[PDB]
């Protein structure tokens, strides 16, 4: 029963935390697994996303080898402070932490051949520069870059343990706005003046779901634009009715745009939704100005030509505008 | 391979943990290098911007002159904690930190001659001077100021290591609503009450992209103003139509002004 005790005691004794495994030898290859517990949020305004995961590192160390114990030794987490571990870090993180309830969420497992499994529960806010020109019809690529701080490729290498099955849990992730179309794993070397450093990259391809915008942005805009055309069928002499309808359609269009601005993220540059909203705004504006032309031309100096042509042109031109928009932005 | 441990221990022993390099001699030429990962956010409300960088401090210290290996024996952990380092700090930062996952983002490289290179991945919430009288047509200078806290130019001096090449990664900066027109590096000596202190400064000239506001703010107002002028062509004896048009255009302008003011 105390055999494991003194076994671990001699294992830790004479252990040099300063030096990597095989300090004079070839570089030590560190395998990595990630289990995505959740992707808590994706912020377009901040251009980042939060990510909770079980991050596990595998590496073979001959100092931590034992015999006569046919069982994998899971040790108390504090032992991680006493052993050597890689200086891994996420190159594009803004803030990250290891969860600490009830104890520090960390695990060390030593295998008899010398393998070390080092697991952490990390929540990290990683940067995701986003191209939002096609918003809400956009498609983002959010990456997590894993790199070693001091050690270079002559001292370590990284690889995805299990190959393409190294990252799990991506299927169970559910986001309210995005769908994770694909995920990808890349392993490369990054050359600097200091030298070549190993790197792993975990990429996610997110497609923004558009069901919200169809019913909140596009259908209301289309319906107000259609209602603006009702004035073309109203009598030219019904100035009160036609002007009230046109100006109230303009007011309703302005309401929808303001509300969307307040509800949607800031993103201070031109997007697809802005172009569609301004197109609808210009259409209702021209519909109101059409009655200005009609009223001036007839009152000031059986259906009039202008309304008769407007009835054809405005639906027609709006159809072409929609066609061009949907082709260009899809 | 115990000899490297003994070398580190013996160079540690007898080393001035507190005294600066060459207390009786000239000041220490502490060079600075920066590799900006990315400027995060720019608050027109809080007057600040968050900046992520790899701050690198270079200096010479004859006391920490080891021997045996020429591959630049780089250290971390306990011995790396207690060797003397400059008291450099950022003057403008409201809040800052050094990243600490999976390990503390820090490194201290010792060259055989005695040179020390101190690298830190830092996130600083520096403060920026914004003259918003011309917003959204404005053009700001955002500066990060680096200064010594206790030591004057007699004890410590600062300079840019590599001239204009010291601060790399400017191209990496990719802010959505701002275009980085130019960057500049400045090195000066301020005069406080105690004496002449050194100072370095890294300035960015950000220019707002005036395409969003033209589309979604100026042109709606212009079109509503034209719609208000529409009433001058309607008949003089159409009181319902012209009054409704005028008062509803006023209502629409107030709506734009009130709701837009909630978004800026």
């Amino acid at each position: 029963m105390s055999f494991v005790k003194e076994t671990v005691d001699k294992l830790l004794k004479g252990y040099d935390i300063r030096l990597r495994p095989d300090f004079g030898g070839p570089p030590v290859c560190v395998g990595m697994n990630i289990d995505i517990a959740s992707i808590d949020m994706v912020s377009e305004v901040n251009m980042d996303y939060t990510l909770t995961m079980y991050f596990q590192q595998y590496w073979r160390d001959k100092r931590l080898a034992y015999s006569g114990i046919p069982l994998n030794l899971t040790l108390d987490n504090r032992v991680a402070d006493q052993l050597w571990v890689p200086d891994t870090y996420f190159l594009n993180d803004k803030k990250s932490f290891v969860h600490g309830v009830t104890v520090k969420n960390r695990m060390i497992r030593l295998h008899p051949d010398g393998t070390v499994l080092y697991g952490l529960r990390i929540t990290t806010t990683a940067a995701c520069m986003m191209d939002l020109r096609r918003y809400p019809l956009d498609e983002q690529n959010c990456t997590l870059e894993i790199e070693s701080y001091g050690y270079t490729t002559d001292d370590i290498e990284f690889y995805w343990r299990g190959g393409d099955k190294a990252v799990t849990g991506v299927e169970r992730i559910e986001l309210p706005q995005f769908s994770i179309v694909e995920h990808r794993l890349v392993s490369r070397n990054v050359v600097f003046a200091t030298g070549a450093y190993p790197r792993l990259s975990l990429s996610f391809r997110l497609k923004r779901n558009i069901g919200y915008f169809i019913l909140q942005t596009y259908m209301p805009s289309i319906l107000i634009t259609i209602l603006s055309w009702v004035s073309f069928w109203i009598n030219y002499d019904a100035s009160a009715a036609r002007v009230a309808l046109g100006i109230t359609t303009v007011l309703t269009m302005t309401t929808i745009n303001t509300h969307l601005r307040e509800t949607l993220p800031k993103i201070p540059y031109v997007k697809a939704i802005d172009m569609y909203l301004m197109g609808c705004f210009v259409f209702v504006f021209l519909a109101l100005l059409e009655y200005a032309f009609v009223n001036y031309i007839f009152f000031g100096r059986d259906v009039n030509a202008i309304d008769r042509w407007s009835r054809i042109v405005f639906p027609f031109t709006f159809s072409l505008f929609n066609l061009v928009y949907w082709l260009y932005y899809v | 391979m115990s000899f490297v441990k003994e070398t580190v221990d013996k160079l540690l022993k007898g080393y001035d943990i507190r005294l600066r390099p060459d207390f009786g001699g000239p000041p220490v030429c502490v060079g600075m290098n920066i590799d900006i990962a990315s400027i995060d956010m720019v608050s027109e409300v809080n007057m600040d911007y968050t900046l992520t960088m790899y701050f690198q401090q270079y200096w010479r210290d004859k006391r920490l002159a080891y021997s045996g290996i020429p591959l630049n024996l780089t250290l971390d952990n306990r011995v790396a904690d207690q060797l003397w380092v400059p008291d450099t700090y950022f003057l403008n930062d409201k809040k800052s930190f050094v990243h600490g996952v999976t390990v503390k983002n820090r490194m201290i490289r010792l060259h055989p001659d005695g040179t020390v290179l101190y690298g830190l991945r830092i996130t600083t919430t520096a403060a920026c001077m914004m003259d918003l009288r011309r917003y959204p047509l404005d053009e700001q200078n955002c500066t990060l100021e680096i200064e010594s806290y206790g030591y004057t130019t007699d004890d410590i001096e600062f300079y840019w290591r590599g001239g204009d090449k010291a601060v790399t990664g400017v191209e990496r900066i990719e802010l959505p609503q701002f275009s980085i027109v130019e960057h500049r590096l400045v090195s000066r000596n301020v005069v406080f009450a105690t004496g002449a202190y050194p100072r370095l400064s890294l300035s960015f000239r950000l220019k707002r992209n005036i395409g969003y506001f033209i589309l979604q703010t100026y042109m709606p107002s212009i079109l509503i103003t034209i719609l208000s002028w529409v009433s001058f062509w309607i008949n003089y004896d159409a009181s319902a139509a012209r009054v409704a048009l005028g008062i509803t255009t006023v209502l629409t302008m107030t709506t734009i002004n009130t709701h837009l003011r909630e978004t800026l």
Epitope: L91, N92, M129, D131, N141, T143, E145, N189, V190, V191, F192, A193 | V170, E171, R172, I173, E174, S179, I180, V181, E182, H183
Partner: nanobody
Framework: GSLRLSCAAS????????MGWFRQAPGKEREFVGA????????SYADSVKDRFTISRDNAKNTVYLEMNNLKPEDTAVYYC??????????????????WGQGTQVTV
């Protein structure tokens, strides 16, 4: 001799914002000439050719123009346009660049 080379990218160009202009002389390895970022500002040039060359960008049509005001006989080489990822690494080194153009040939 106001020469103007052009590099046109087709595909996921946002994923590779930096475009670097390189040149490889006969026999010699590939040299670094210049670089341009996504916004088109905050450019960079090599020390040797810092003033001779200029770089311009237009993302409306997604092209990069490289302008030479004065040419020299030693400039005879194959000019290459390369792309680089955001967190790829340092500018001056060729291995960090993923996608290479076939590169035009310039002789003077």
């Amino acid at each position: 001799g106001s020469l103007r080379l052009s590099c046109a990218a087709s595909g996921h160009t946002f994923n590779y914002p930096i475009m670097g202009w390189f040149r490889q002389a006969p026999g010699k390895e590939r040299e670094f000439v210049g670089a341009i970022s996504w916004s088109g500002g905050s450019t960079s040039y090599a020390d040797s050719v810092k003033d001779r060359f200029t770089i311009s960008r237009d993302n409306a049509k997604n092209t990069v123009y490289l302008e030479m005001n004065n040419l020299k006989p030693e400039d005879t080489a194959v000019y290459y346009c390369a792309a680089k990822g955001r967190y790829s690494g340092g500018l001056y080194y060729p291995t960090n660049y993923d996608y290479w153009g076939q590169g035009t040939q310039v002789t003077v």
